[PDB]
């Protein structure tokens, strides 16, 4: 089991850490949502699916920088929604193919009501998402840690 990012990098068997740079809507008004869809960015696969089932959770999601201070939101993982920053590990999603498949994580973020002007700075860390991978085969229990960065400023107009 290993993962890769779009036009990007890989975190190999055994886990590790990587940076993911995402383009964000440049303007988001109070009452609109900023959507950070990692399912187009992070892809994973099972290396021996004919005998091994891989189990993958979002063990934890935390907010940083402008997202931490100026937005509130939720995280959607494989079709269910949870608080973000997270309060517990999600249910497992099964990976059972050698073909790269999306990690089905998306953040749905909305400006706090007093936010105005530059709410997220270009180049800044906005989130850390920990993918936890286990299996039905051995004692493997690995973390794949994704540091998520904004490529551009996001402005909340006034």
- Footprint of ligand HNW on this chain (CB under 6 A)? 1, 13, 46-48, 52, 54, 135, 137, 139-140
Backbone angles phi, psi at 20, to 5 degrees: -125, 125
1 binds, among its own copies, Ni ion, ligand HNW, none (CB under 5 to 8 A by kind): ligand HNW
Nearest to 5 by CA among 142, 143, 153, 145: 145
Q: Which is nearer to Ni ion, 47 or 89 (CB)?
A: 47
Torsion angle in degrees (nearest 10) through CA of 116, 120, 121, 122: -130
Q: Which is nearer to ligand HNW, 1 or 71 (CB)?
A: 1
Structure tokens at 152: 């551009």
Contact 91, 56 (CB under 8 A): no
| Binding segment (CB under 5 A) for Ni ion, from list 16-24, 41-49, 57-65, 99-107 | 41-49
Instruction: Supply the minimum distance, in Å, between the C-beta of residue 36 and Ni ion.
Output: 26
Among 81, 65, 73, residue whose Cα is nearest residue 118 = 65
Q: Which does 154 bind (CB under 5 to 8 A by kind): ligand HNW, Ni ion, its own copies, none?
A: none
Q: Please report, as ranges, the residues that interact with Ni ion according to CB under 5 A.
A: 47
């Amino acid at each position: 089991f290993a993962c890769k990012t779009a036009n990007g990098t890989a975190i190999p068997i055994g886990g590790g850490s990587a940076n993911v740079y995402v383009n964000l809507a440049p303007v988001v008004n109070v009452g609109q949502n900023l959507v950070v869809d990692l399912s187009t960015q992070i892809f994973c696969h099972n290396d021996y699916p004919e005998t091994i089932t891989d189990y993958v959770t979002l063990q934890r999601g935390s907010a940083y920088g402008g997202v931490l201070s100026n937005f509130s939101g939720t995280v959607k993982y494989s079709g269910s929604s949870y608080p973000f920053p997270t309060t517990s590990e999600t249910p497992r999603v099964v990976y059972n193919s050698r073909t790269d498949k999306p990690w089905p994580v998306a953040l749905y973020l909305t400006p706090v009501s007093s936010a105005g002007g530059v709410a997220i700075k270009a180049g800044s860390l906005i989130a850390v998402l920990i993918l936890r991978q286990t299996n039905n085969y051995n004692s493997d229990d690995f973390q794949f840690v994704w540091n998520i960065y904004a490529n551009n400023d996001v402005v909340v107009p006034t």
